[PDB]
Write a protein that binds this ligand. Sequence first.
Ligand SMILES: O=C(O)CNC(=O)C(=O)O
Ligand SMILES: [Mg+2]
Ligand code: NI
Ligand SMILES: [Zn+2]
Length: 331
Amino acid sequence: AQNPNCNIMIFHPTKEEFNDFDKYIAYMESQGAHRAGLAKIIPPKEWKARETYDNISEILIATPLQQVASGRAGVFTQYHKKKKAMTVGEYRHLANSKKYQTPPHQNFEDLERKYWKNRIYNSPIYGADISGSLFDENTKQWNLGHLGTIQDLLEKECGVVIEGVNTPYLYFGMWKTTFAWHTEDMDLYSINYLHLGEPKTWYVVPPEHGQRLERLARELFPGSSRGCGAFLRHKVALISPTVLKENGIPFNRITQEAGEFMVTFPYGYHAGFNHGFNCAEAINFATPRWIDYGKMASQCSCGEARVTFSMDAFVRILQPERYDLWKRGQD
Ligand SMILES: O=C(O)CNC(=O)C(=O)O
Ligand SMILES: [Mg+2]
Ligand code: NI
Ligand SMILES: [Zn+2]
């Protein structure tokens, strides 16, 4: 079995190997990359996403989200308070202000220590979940707006044509902005490109051990767990590396820098934080190997998770027994 310890693998494809996206994902899996739940891909030196980032300041962040924490430093939830619209130039100035800017630090490990010590005492503002793309239309390799769609993959594997679309999303971050522990909708893959700015630190649980994280989460968030049998779908719970280690939960960590891709694999729980002002692009995708994960994915039906239009067909076709309950939670 390749990668039996489930380490995060880093890949350096050549420009030739960068042509065929599906083929390279399959290659990484042949080497055991998916066992970690997360892989890093460093593009060949010849590649670029676009020419420059000098002209992005007029993008609008219609609903910036202030991420307010509750709990203790290593075990907390966050809620999202909606703020007034602002441009990317305005948001960048805010991120760099004395109130929000990254503190002085020695290295990534020192900043990680500071994050986990102090995160709860601040409420950073995240420009998350903005439909759009920063890839140039002329970029032919690993362009996240030109990937094969998940509806086409389902149709190719299973023969059923379905409605829905699959487009990317932009994320503008600042120091301490946080993504809570989650797997993707329908336990899909994700791919995330860090276009510019400061790093993003990731934590990940191997897919074969995801249920260990779920059991800990039920213990640590006992009210939330009574409320919903899949409350990590709400995407609000944080647990620190120290608490994971105290409870024997297998996990790994890595820091993504500008110009690098990360891939999350089906049922790979992940969480993390941004180091300072940055911009990432991400999208979900599928492969043949996903279909069995999609069929078995948990679902939230309590009302909280509320998701896109395109998840309806995935539940309907892959999980017909669960469909009526899930759709009620949508309504
Ligand atoms: O960057 C973020 O805030 C969150 N991203 C992801 O969870 C992802 O790419 O799968
Ligand atoms: Mg602009
Ligand atoms: Ni994700
Ligand atoms: Zn729920």
